[PDB]
Write a protein that binds this ligand. Structure first.
Ligand SMILES: [Zn+2]
Ligand SMILES: [Zn+2]
Ligand SMILES: [Zn+2]
Ligand SMILES: [Zn+2]
Length: 227
């Protein structure tokens, strides 16, 4: 039985650019383009997965639909609530944001709040782990990697009354120690910045993702997501 594959899209910023952002090439996706990408996925019959569904699918090697996708957003930026979330609701799409818990605990205005996450969880959104302070985990000792990955999970689990199962490593950096620790902390899924469609063979704690480029037309994105 052929191993299943799952496109895991990696978004970051989605908002209208500031005057200074237009002066230099960057990676911010225009909201209108995000709308058009989701519209095309919906028309093509894509099923939008939660983290729990990705784990089940990869573990049992079966997809809940012919076309599936895991929409992921890193860094728990406020534009996910102000811009991305309304557009996701418009298309009845589910998505995951990987949260830097320290910025939320410190009250950063640039980042998602607990109240916003509680609202979004009731309309399809999931909030997973992106460490407490967003260090390069690879350059941290085993004890520090444990703290960064554990204390943030405990925060999301308690404050959002959940069992966090997925982590995104900051900047996609990890070593053997990172993955051993993530497993011992009862993470089920881990996502990297290694480009490609994902499958169990990547390593469940080291899954590929598809980087969303700002020049990425909906037609070309969908072709990239095909196995
Ligand atoms: Zn900006
Ligand atoms: Zn990050
Ligand atoms: Zn490295
Ligand atoms: Zn090592």
């Amino acid at each position: 039985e052929t191993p299943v594959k799952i496109p895991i899209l990696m978004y970051h910023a989605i908002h209208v650019m500031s005057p200074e952002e237009t002066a230099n090439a960057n990676l911010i996706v225009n909201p209108d383009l995000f709308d058009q990408q989701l519209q095309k996925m919906k028309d093509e019959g894509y099923y939008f997965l939660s983290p729990e569904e990705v784990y089940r699918a990869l573990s049992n090697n079966e997809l809940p639909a012919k076309k599936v996708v895991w929409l992921t957003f890193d860094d728990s930026m406020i534009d996910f609530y102000n811009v991305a979330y309304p557009i996701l609701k418009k298309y009845d799409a589910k998505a995951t944001n990987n949260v830097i818990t320290g910025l939320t605990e410190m009250g950063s205005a640039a980042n998602l709040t607990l109240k916003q996450m509680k609202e979004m969880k009731q309309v399809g959104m999931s909030f997973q782990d992106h460490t407490v302070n967003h260090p390069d985990l690879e350059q941290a000792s085993p004890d520090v990697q444990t703290t960064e990955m554990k204390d943030s999970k405990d925060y999301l689990d308690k404050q959002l009354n959940q069992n966090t199962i997925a982590i995104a490593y900051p900047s996609g950096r990890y070593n053997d120690t990172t993955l051993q620790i993530a497993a011992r902390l009862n993470y089920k899924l881990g996502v990297t910045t290694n480009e490609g469609i994902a499958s169990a063979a990547n390593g469940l704690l080291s899954l590929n993702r598809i980087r969303i480029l700002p020049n990425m037309s909906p037609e070309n994105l969908l072709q990239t997501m095909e196995p």
